[PDB]
């Protein structure tokens, strides 16, 4: 599982044609603020295919 297949799972809005997303900021978390953590209701938007 050499997992160099990172992609994006979550975004605030729909991606427009011919735009690249590079930021690793934490996903939406509308109810509680994540404040820069990967705890409860806090996921990084980068997962691999495996």
């Amino acid at each position, epitope marked *: 599982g050499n997992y160099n297949y990172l992609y994006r*799972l979550f975004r605030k809005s729909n991606l427009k044609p011919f735009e690249r997303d590079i930021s690793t900021e934490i996903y939406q978390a509308g*109810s*509680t603020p994540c404040n820069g953590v990967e*705890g*409860f*209701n806090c*996921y990084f938007p980068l997962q691999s295919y495996g």
Partner: antibody, heavy 123, light 107 residues
Framework: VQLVESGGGLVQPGRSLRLSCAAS????????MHWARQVPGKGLEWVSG????????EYADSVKGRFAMSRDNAKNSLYLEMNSLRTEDTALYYC?????????????????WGQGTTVTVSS | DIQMTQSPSSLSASVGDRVTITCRAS??????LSWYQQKPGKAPKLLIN???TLQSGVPPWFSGSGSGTDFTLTISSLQPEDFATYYC?????????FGQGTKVEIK
């Protein structure tokens, strides 16, 4: 504010195994003690929780009636008794404090994380 | 919360048949889902976790897939131990609800 876990080990399913973590560097208050489990390579799962003034005990959806918790503030150590052990409960155990025992808006606790002792169950 | 339902509410099959259990969600569940197996008068057990991973001690003929909203579970061959009721629950957000339950009987 250091949390050191202990009590994890290898044991057959169906047997009891009590784990504990001592609270050090924490000023005494009515902080809601919580427990979180992590399957390795998976997400985060909460287990149970006890708030201040005793009582107020709740568990997760699948551990109702099989987990027992009691809080003793004199020893500054919290223990959980494990009953009806299955092969699913193999995970990494983190015990959290959330450090917000406020009278107004007690919810919204920043759950801290300790070193953590995992458990292994082999059938 | 999340209002969930499962279909069918009951099933009837013999030994060796191919049946499927499907249960969807009203909110985006992606992949974090568990399929419990519980017997009458006994404790539950987990067979498939995260909709794609086979648990330790679980036989490999229980195979599942699904992403987004629609979820499914497939049985290659049925066994004498397989005849029981089945639950599927979500594991994403603020506290979850269980399923109404399906049942497989001898036809």
């Amino acid at each position: 504010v250091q949390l050191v876990e202990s009590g994890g080990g290898l044991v057959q399913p169906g047997r009891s195994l009590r784990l504990s973590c001592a609270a050090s560097g924490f000023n005494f208050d009515d902080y809601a003690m919580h427990w979180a489990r992590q399957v390795p390579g998976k997400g985060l799962e909460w287990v149970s929780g006890i708030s201040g003034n005793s009582g107020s005990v709740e568990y997760a959806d699948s551990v109702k009636g099989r987990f027992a918790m009691s809080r003793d503030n004199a020893k500054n150590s919290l223990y959980l008794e494990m009953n009806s052990l299955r092969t699913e409960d193999t995970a990494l155990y983190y015990c959290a404090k959330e450090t917000t025992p406020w009278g107004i808006y007690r919810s919204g606790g920043l759950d801290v994380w300790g070193q953590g002792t995992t458990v292994t169950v082999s059938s | 919360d999340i209002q969930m339902t499962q279909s069918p509410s009951s099933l009837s099959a013999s030994v060796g048949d191919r049946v499927t259990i499907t249960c969807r969600a009203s909110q985006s569940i992606h992949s974090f889902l568990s399929w419990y197996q519980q017997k009458p008068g006994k404790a539950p057990k987990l067979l498939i976790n995260s909709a794609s991973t086979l648990q330790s001690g679980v036989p490999p003929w229980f195979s599942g897939s699904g992403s987004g909203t629609d979820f499914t579970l497939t049985i290659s061959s049925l066994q004498p131990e397989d005849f029981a009721t089945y639950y599927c629950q979500q594991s994403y957000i603020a506290p979850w609800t269980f399923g109404q339950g399906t049942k497989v009987e001898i036809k």
